[PDB]
Amino acid sequence: NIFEMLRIDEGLRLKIYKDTEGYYTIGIGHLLTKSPSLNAAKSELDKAIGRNTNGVITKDEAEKLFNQDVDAAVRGILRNAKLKPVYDSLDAVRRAALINMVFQMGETGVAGFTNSLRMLQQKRWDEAAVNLAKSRWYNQTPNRAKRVITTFRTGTWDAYMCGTEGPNFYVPFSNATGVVRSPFEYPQYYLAEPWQFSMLAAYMFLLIVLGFPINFLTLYVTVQHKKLRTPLNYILLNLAVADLFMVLGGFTSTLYTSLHGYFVFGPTGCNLQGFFATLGGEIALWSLVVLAIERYVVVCKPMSNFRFGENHAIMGVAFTWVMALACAAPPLAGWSRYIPEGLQCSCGIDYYTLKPEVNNESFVIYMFVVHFTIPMIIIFFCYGQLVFTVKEAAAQQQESATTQKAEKEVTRMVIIYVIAFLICWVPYASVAFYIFTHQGSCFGPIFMTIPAFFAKSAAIYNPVIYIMMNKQFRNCMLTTICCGKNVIFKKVSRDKSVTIYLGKRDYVDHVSQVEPVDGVVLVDPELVKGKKVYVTLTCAFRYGQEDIDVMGLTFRRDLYFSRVQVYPPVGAMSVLTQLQESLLKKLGDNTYPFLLTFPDYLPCSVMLQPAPQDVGKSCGVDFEVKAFASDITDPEEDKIPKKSSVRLLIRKVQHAPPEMGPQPSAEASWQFFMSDKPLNLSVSLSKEIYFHGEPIPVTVTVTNNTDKVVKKIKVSVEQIANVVLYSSDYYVKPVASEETQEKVQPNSTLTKTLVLVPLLANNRERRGIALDGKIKHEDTNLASSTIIKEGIDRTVMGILVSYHIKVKLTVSGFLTSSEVATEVPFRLMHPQP
Numbered sequence: 001n002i003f004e005m006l007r008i009d010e011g012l013r014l015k016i017y018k019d020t021e022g023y024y025t026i027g028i029g030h031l032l033t034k035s036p037s038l039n040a041a042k043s044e045l046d047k048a049i050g051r052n053t054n055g056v057i058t059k060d061e062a063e064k065l066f067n068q069d070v071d072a073a074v075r076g077i078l079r080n081a082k083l084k085p086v087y088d089s090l091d092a093v094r095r096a097a098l099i100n101m102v103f104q105m106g107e108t109g110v111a112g113f114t115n116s117l118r119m120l121q122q123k124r125w126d127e128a129a130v131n132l133a134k135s136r137w138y139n140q141t142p143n144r145a146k147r148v149i150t151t152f153r154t155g156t157w158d159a160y161m162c163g164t165e166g167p168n169f170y171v172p173f174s175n176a177t178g179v180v181r182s183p184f185e186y187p188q189y190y191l192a193e194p195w196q197f198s199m200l201a202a203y204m205f206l207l208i209v210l211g212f213p214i215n216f217l218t219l220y221v222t223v224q225h226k227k228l229r230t231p232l233n234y235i236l237l238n239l240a241v242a243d244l245f246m247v248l249g250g251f252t253s254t255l256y257t258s259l260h261g262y263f264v265f266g267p268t269g270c271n272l273q274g275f276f277a278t279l280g281g282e283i284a285l286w287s288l289v290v291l292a293i294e295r296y297v298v299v300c301k302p303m304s305n306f307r308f309g310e311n312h313a314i315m316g317v318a319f320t321w322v323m324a325l326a327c328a329a330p331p332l333a334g335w336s337r338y339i340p341e342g343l344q345c346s347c348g349i350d351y352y353t354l355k356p357e358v359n360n361e362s363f364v365i366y367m368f369v370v371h372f373t374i375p376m377i378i379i380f381f382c383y384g385q386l387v388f389t390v391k392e393a394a395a396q397q398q399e400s401a402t403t404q405k406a407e408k409e410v411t412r413m414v415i416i417y418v419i420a421f422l423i424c425w426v427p428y429a430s431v432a433f434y435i436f437t438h439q440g441s442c443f444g445p446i447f448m449t450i451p452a453f454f455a456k457s458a459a460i461y462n463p464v465i466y467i468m469m470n471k472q473f474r475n476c477m478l479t480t481i482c483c484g485k486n487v488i489f490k491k492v493s494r495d496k497s498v499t500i501y502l503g504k505r506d507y508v509d510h511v512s513q514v515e516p517v518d519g520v521v522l523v524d525p526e527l528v529k530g531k532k533v534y535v536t537l538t539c540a541f542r543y544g545q546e547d548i549d550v551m552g553l554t555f556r557r558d559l560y561f562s563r564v565q566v567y568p569p570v571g572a573m574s575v576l577t578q579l580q581e582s583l584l585k586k587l588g589d590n591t592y593p594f595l596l597t598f599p600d601y602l603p604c605s606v607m608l609q610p611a612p613q614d615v616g617k618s619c620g621v622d623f624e625v626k627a628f629a630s631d632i633t634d635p636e637e638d639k640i641p642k643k644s645s646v647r648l649l650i651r652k653v654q655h656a657p658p659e660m661g662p663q664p665s666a667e668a669s670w671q672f673f674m675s676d677k678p679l680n681l682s683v684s685l686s687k688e689i690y691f692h693g694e695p696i697p698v699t700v701t702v703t704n705n706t707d708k709v710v711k712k713i714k715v716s717v718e719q720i721a722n723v724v725l726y727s728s729d730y731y732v733k734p735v736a737s738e739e740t741q742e743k744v745q746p747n748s749t750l751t752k753t754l755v756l757v758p759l760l761a762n763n764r765e766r767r768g769i770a771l772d773g774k775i776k777h778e779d780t781n782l783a784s785s786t787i788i789k790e791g792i793d794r795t796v797m798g799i800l801v802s803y804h805i806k807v808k809l810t811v812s813g814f815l816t817s818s819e820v821a822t823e824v825p826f827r828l829m830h831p832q833p
Contacts, residue, residue: 002096003066004440005160006103009144012062016041016055026055027062029103030069073099076107083110086117094120097151104144105137125153147176162442163353168267169339170353172445183344184270187261191343191445197261200345204255207456211247214463215240218473221480228476230548230616231313232298235290236473238317239466242283246459249276254346263340263347274338274347275328281455282324282371284462288421289375290316291466292382295552298544300389302725305544306608306617306767327367336363342448351432352448354439364432372429379421383414389726390554396795400561402638406554413469413553420465424458427451472551488583493646497527500535500627500646501587503579505775507598507623509654511787514598517650520583520591521627523567528629533567535627536637537596539652541725541798543619557725559621559797560602563637566592566627596625598652600789603798605651605773608721612765621798622773623650651773654784656829661688664805666824674814677706681822683807689827692781696826698805699753704744711810711817714739717758718823719783721770722800735763735782735803743812756805758782758828770801785827803828 010029016038019025024032024041032041038055045053048068049061057065077083077098087095101110113135119128129149132138138145150159163172164180171180171191179190189197218240222228253273257263263270294316297304331338331349337358341348351364387410394407428451435443467473478486490501502519509515521535539560549555573580573593580593607620628645630636667682682701690696698715715738721731736758744750760782763769770783783801808821 001093001157001440002070002099003063005096005100005157006066008160008162008442009100009147010103012059014057014059014062016045026057027065028069030062030065069103070099073102073107077102080107080111082117083107086121089121091155093155093157094152097148100148101137104141109137120152125155129153143176165353168270168337169344170350171344172342172352172443172448183263183340184266185262188344189261194261196446197258197343197345200258200343201255203453204251204258207251207460208247208255210460211243211251211463214460214468215243215247217477217480218463218467219244221473221476224480225476227547228472230545231308231310232294232548232552234310234313235287235294235316235320236467236470238320239284239287239291240463242280242287243459243463244280245276245283246280246456249273250280250346251456251459257345258343261345263344270340270347271332271338274349275332277347278328278331278338278349279324280459282328283320284459285371285375285425286320286323287317288462288466289378290320292379296382296386299386299553300726301729302541302543302619303723303729303731303768305619306610306614309614309617327371330363334358336360342445342452344445346452348452352435352443364436368429368432372425375421375425380418383417386553387411387414393557393726400558401635402558402561405638410554413465416465416469420458420461423454424462425455427454470551472547488579491646491648493644495527495643497524497644498522498533498627498629498646500625500648501583502625502648502650505649506651506653509598509604509652511657511789514600514602514652516598517594517596517625518577518579519625520580520587520593521566522587523590523592523629525590528567531629531631532565532633533592533627533629534563534634534637535566535594535596536563536625537561537598538624538626539598539602539621540624541621543725545616545618557797560599561637562596563634564594564596565634566594601792601794601796602652603796603800604654604784604786606783606786606799606801607771607773608799609763609766609769609771611767614767620773623652624648625650649775651775653772654787654829655832656689656691656827657787658832661827664688664824664826666822668822670820672706672708672813672818675707679704679706679708679820681807681809681820683805683822683824685805685824685826687826689829691831692828693757693759696756696758696805697753698756698807699751700807701749701751702744702809703749704746707746708814708818709746709812710744711812712739712741712743713752713754714808714810715754715756716806716808717756718804718806719770720802720804721768721783722802724795724797724800731768733768735769758803770799782828784829 006028012028013026016024016026016032019029023034024038026032026041026045032044035041042053042055045055045057048065049057077087083098083102087098090098098110113132116128116131119131129152132145132149132152138149147159151157162174163170164175166182169183171183171188173180173191219237222233222237250273253265253269257265265273294308298308330336335358337350337355338347339350340346341350349367350358350360354360390407390410394403397403431448431451468477488501488503490499492499499522500519501521502517507515507517517537521533523533538558540556540558542556543549544556569592573595576584576593584591584593603621605622607622610617624647626645626647628640630641630644664685665683667680669681670679671677680703684699684701686697696717700713700715702710702713704710716734717736719733719735721733723729723731736756738754738756740752740754742750742752760771760780763782772780772783774780785802786800788796788800802825804823804825806821806823808819811818811820
C-alpha cells in the first residue's frame with residue numbers, strides 16, 4: 001500500500017540521479033550524500049545495499065532503501081510532539097498519507113501544519129483538505145498533492161487506483177487528467193501513439209495473409225488426397241480448424257477495430273470475439289497435448305497402431321473440444337469475463353483486474369495451474385520419454401545407419417517442438433503470474449500486448465512446425481501448390497534391367513544354424529554400364545501405414561539389415577551350391593551369384609490378424625530380399641531408385657524339432673481364507689510339442705479335500721503374444737476353450753480329460769491374433785511357437801510367440817465365486833516334411 005503510493009507519486013528511479021535540489025538521490029527519494037562527489041554517494045550506497053552497485057540497484061533493493069526510509073521517517077514522526085499524536089490517532093491508510101507528506105517536505109515541512117493536524121486529530125476531514133489545498137504544497141505539486149488530499153478525505157486508496165475500471169471493461173490508464181472514455185464508444189488514442197494502432201492493423205493483416213491460406217490449404221489438401229486421411233492426422237486436422245477460428249473469429253475482428261482505434265462491436269461482440277479467440281487457442285493447445293500422447297503410445301508400443309482407429313482419434317479431438325469449452329464457456333456464463341485487453345482493441349480473458357463479482361482469482365488460478373502445468377507435464381513427459389526410448393534404442397543397434405539418421409531428425413524436431421511451445425504460452429503465463437504477485441503495481445497497454453504478440457504468432461508458426469515441416473504434408477502440399485504435379489522362380493524389375501532369381505521363398509530356421517538365402521541375379525550390360533549392382537538382405541519389423549509413420553517423427557524399425565555387392569564382385573563367390581551352378585548353366589553369361597546368411601538372434605516371420613472392419617491397419621514382421629542398381633558407393637542404401645530395384649519377400653520358418661521335450665505335467669495346491677484344507681490339482685498333457693490341427697487332450701486330475709464345492713472346470717488354449725520392439729510387452733490371448741459342467745464334491749476326487757482343437761477358422765474376425773507370415777494375401781495358420789537359441793549374446797527383438805494350456809477352476813465358495821487357475825506351456829509348430 002504505502003510502498004505503492006510513494007512509487008507512483010515520487011517515482012522509482014533505479015540509477016543515481018540529481019533531484020530538483022541537485023543532490024545525489026537514489027530510488028524513491030532515497031538520498032545518498034550532500035557532497036558534490038559521486039563516489040561519496042556510491043560509498044554510502046554500496047555499504048547500504050551490500051555489493052558493488054556502481055549506481056545501479058535492483059527494483060527490490062530500491063524497495064528496501066525505501067523501507068529503511070519508512071522506518072526512519074516513522075521514528076522521526078514519533079520523536080516529534082506534534083506529529084506523534086496525529087500518527088497515533090489516524091488509521092493505517094491515513095498514516096501512509098502522512099508519511100508521504102513527511103517524505104518529500106521532511107519533518108520540517110509537515111511540522112508547520114497547525115490547523116490541518118488539529119482538524120485531522122479531531123476527525124474533521126473536509127476542512128483539513130481545504131486547508132491542505134490552500135498551502136504551498138498543493139501549489140508545488142498539484143499532481144501528487146491532489147491524490148494525497150483526496151486520500152485524507154475518503155480514507156480509501158481510490159485516488160491511488162492504477163487504471164480506470166468500468167462495467168464491461170478495464171483501461172490501464174489514469175482518469176485523473178480526465179481523458180478516459182469508453183472503449184465501446186470513443187477512440188483510445190490517449191493510451192498509445194496513433195501509429196501503433198496502424199501497426200496493430202498491419203500486424204493483424206499479416207496474420208490473416210499467412211494464417212488463413214496455410215490452415216485452409218491443410219484441410220483442402222486433405223479433402224483431395226486419400227493418403228492423408230488417417231486417425232493420427234485427425235488431431236493434426238483439428239489443429240488446423242482451431243487456427244482457422246483464431247483467424248476468422250479473432251484477427252479479422254481485431255483488424256477492423258484496430259483501424260478505428262476502439263472496439264466498435266460492443267460488449268456482445270467482445271464476448272463472441274474473445275470466445276472464439278480463446279476456443280481457437282485452447283483447441284490448438286490440447287491438440288498438441290493429444291498429439292504428444294498419441295505419438296508416445298503409438299511409436300513406443302507397436303501394438304497400439306492397430307488400436308488407434310477412427311473412434312480413438314475422435315475421442316482425442318472430442319477431449320480437445322471439451323477441455324477447450326470447459327475453460328472458454330465460463331467467462332460467458334459468469335466465472336471470469338471477456339474484456340478488451342491491452343490497447344482495448346483485442347478482447348481476451350481478464351487475468352489482471354481482480355473482480356470478486358466474476359471471481360477472477362479462482363479462475364486465473366484454475367486456468368493457469370491446469371492449462372499450463374498439465375500440458376507442460378504431459379508434453380515434456382511424452383516427448384521426453386519418446387526421445388529417451390529412441391536414443392536408448394538407437395544405441396542398442398548402432399550398426400544400422402538408417403536408425404541414426406532418424407534418431408537425429410527426431411531429436412532436432414523435439415527440441416523445436418519444446419521451443420515453439422514455450423515461446424507461445426510462457427509470455428502469457430509469466431506476465432499473468434507477475435501481475436498476480438505484484439497487484440499493487442501498474443502495467444501499461446503495450447506490456448499486455450507482448451504476450452498477445454507471441455501467442456497469436458503461434459497461430460502462424462505452429463502450422464509451420466507441426467504441418468508444413470511434416471514430411472507427408474510437405475510432399476502432399478507440394479502436389480497441390482504446384483497444380484497436381486511435383487521349381488526355381490524369379491522376379492523382373494520395372495525397367496527390366498536387373499532380374500533376381502531365388503530357389504525358394506520358405507527358408508527354414510533350425511535352432512543351431514539358419515538355412516541361408518541362395519540365388520543369382522541377371523544383369524543387362526548395356527543398361528547397367530558404369531554402375532554398381534547390389535544384392536541386399538533385409539529383415540524388417542512393420543507397424544502402421546507406410547506414408548504416415550515416416551511423417552510423424554521416425555519410421556518403422558528394421559530388426560536386421562545386410563547389403564551385399566554383386567556386379568562387379570570382389571573376386572567371386574568361394575564355392576557354389578547346386579542351385580547356383582544349375583542357374584549359371586541355364587542362364588546366359590551375365591549371371592552373378594549371391595549367398596546371404598541369417599544370424600542366430602533374429603525372430604521368425606510372424607504377422608498379426610486384423611479385424612474385417614480394419615481396412616487400413618497392418619502390423620507384422622517379414623523378410624525381404626532386394627536387388628538394385630545405383631551410381632553411388634556402398635553407404636547410399638538409405639535411398640534407392642524405384643525403377644531399377646526389384647524385391648521378393650521370404651520367410652524364416654521354424655519346423656518342429658525331431659526329439660520331443662518331456663511330457664508336460666504341472667501341479668499346484670491351494671488354500672482359502674477361512675478353510676485351511678488343501679485343494680490339490682495336477683495337470684498333464686500327451687506331448688510337449690503339438691502340431692497344427694492336432695487334438696490336445698488335457699488330462700486334468702483334481703483331488704478335493706476342502707469344504708467348498710467347485711462350480712465348473714474350464715480349460716483354455718491361450719496364445720501368449722510376446723511383442724518386443726522398444727520394450728518387452730507380453731500380450732496374452734485365448735485361442736480355444738472348452739469347459740465341463742461337472743462338479744467336484746468335498747472329500748471326492750475326479751479324473752477327466754478334455755480335448756481342445758486350436759484352429760484359425762474358429763478364431764477369425766479377431767484383433768491381435770498372431771499368425772504365420774503370409775506370402776501374398778493367401779490363407780495361413782496360427783502362429784508357430786518361437787524358439788530361441790541357448791545363451792546368446794544379443795536380445796531377440798520382434799514378435800515372439802508361445803502357447804500354454806491354462807486350466808481354471810470356478811470354485812463355488814461362500815453367491816461369491818473364487819476362480820483359481822494354473823498354466824502349463826506347450827508348442828504348436830509344423831511337422832518335418
